[PDB]
Amino acid sequence: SQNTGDTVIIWGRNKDEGSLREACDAGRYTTVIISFLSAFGYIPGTYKLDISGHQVSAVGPDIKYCQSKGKLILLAIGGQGGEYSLPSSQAAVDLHDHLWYSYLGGRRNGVYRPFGDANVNGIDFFIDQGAREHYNELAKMLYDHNKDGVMVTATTRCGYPDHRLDEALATGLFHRIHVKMFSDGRCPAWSRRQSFEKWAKTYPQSRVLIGVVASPDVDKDAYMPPEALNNLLQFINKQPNFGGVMVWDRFYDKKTGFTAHL
């Protein structure tokens, strides 16, 4: 197909999409983004993982299985709700420590790890809501584990710049950027190519992926059928840092077969 890069699937938004291991056994994806750690910052010590009623006890064994099959697993922070922001630098430190000891490679007895002894491979900054401040500091704190892996990625709205992420991206620490064509802030169809290329050329050291929906039931205006996405990909895959396609989401990708038809 014209997707020369990774295929990244969002998982966690509907329990009826099946387990994480099922997504990894589908033969379709290189990376799964578990979505979302959806509450933090507004209340000290309050953090919520919203994976739509998926059983957390199944996730850890499935992460280890997925990684044994060569898949990368990221946890997305943020999401589309209104229960998260970083109101201070201390909020960023607190969220760092929560992520490191609850989900990443850190260990501290007494900390609840929803996925047990499994480690996610990194954190996606899906900062679609709330205020912009202090994510640059969180990115530095997460990245610093690589200096003494933690992949640091972001998922942005369609138009460049995304003011919720621009300061964090300016740190230069983001390995991947997933540019949503869909959701609030969606580009008008005529501008998708130029918008994506602006993102790609602005961040030449990152792999830059195009985010699409698997069904017009998710976003009717932003949906591109496989044939139309391949027409767009034949242009944007010429960017040297084109990174692949991110698809919202596993439930709808199963429903339509989108990635299997690309």
Residue numbers in the entry: 6 to 153, 159 to 272
Question: What do the paper's sentences say?
Answer:
Plants have evolved xylanase inhibitor proteins as part of their defense mechanisms against phytopathogens. The rice xylanase inhibitor protein (OsXIP) is structurally similar to GH18 chitinase and homologous to wheat XIP-type inhibitor (XIP-I), which inhibits both GH10 and GH11 xylanases. Various inhibition and interaction analyses showed that OsXIP competitively inhibits the hydrolytic activity of GH11 xylanase RXyn2, but not the activity of GH10 xylanase RXyn1 from Rhizopus oryzae. Although XIP-type inhibitors share significant sequence similarity with GH18 chitinases and adopt a (β/α)8-barrel fold, they are thought to be devoid of chitinase activity because of lack of the catalytic DxDxE motif, which is completely conserved in the catalytic domains of GH18 chitinases.
The OsXIP structure was refined to Rwork/Rfree of 16.6%/17.9% at a resolution of 1.30 Å and shown to adopt a (β/α)8-barrel fold, as observed in family GH18 chitinase structures. Electron density maps of the amino acid residues (Arg155-Val158) consisting of a part of the loop between α4 and β5 (Lα4β5OsXIP) were unobservable in the structure. Although OsXIP shares only 38.2% and 27.6% sequence identity, respectively, with XIP-I and hevamine, a GH18 chitinase from rubber tree Hevea brasiliensis, the main chain structure of OsXIP was closely similar to those of XIP-I and hevamine with RMSDs of 0.85 and 0.77 Å for the corresponding 260 and 253 Cα atoms, respectively. However, in the OsXIP structure, these amino acid residues were substituted, that is, Gln9→Arg18, Asn34→Ser43, Asn45→Asp55, Gly81→Gln85, Ile82→Gly86, Asp125→Phe131, Glu127→Asp133, Tyr183→Phe192, Ala224→Val228, and Trp255→Trp258, respectively, and the substitutions appeared to have caused the protein to lose binding ability of allosamidin. The catalytic signature motif, DxDxE, conserved in GH18 chitinases, was found in center of the groove of hevamine, but not in the structure of OsXIP. In most GH18 chitinases, three disulfide bonds (SS1, SS2, and SS3) are conserved; however, only the two disulfide bonds corresponding to SS1 and SS3 of hevamine are formed in the structure of OsXIP. In particular, the loop between α4 and β5 extruded from the opposite side of the DxDxE catalytic site in hevamine (Lα4β5hev, magenta) consisting of only four amino acid residues (Gly148-Val151), while the corresponding loop in OsXIP (Lα4β5OsXIP) was made of eight amino acid residues (Asp153-Val160) (brown). Although OsXIP possessed Arg155 at the corresponding position, electron density maps of the residues making up a part of Lα4β5OsXIP (Arg155-Val158) were not observed, indicating Lα4β5OsXIP being more conformationally flexible than Lα4β5XIP-I. Furthermore XIP-I has Lys234 in helix α7 (light green), which forms a salt bridge with the acid-base catalyst Glu131 and water-mediated hydrogen bond with the nucleophile Glu239 of XLNC, a GH10 xylanase from A. nidulans, to inhibit its catalytic activity.
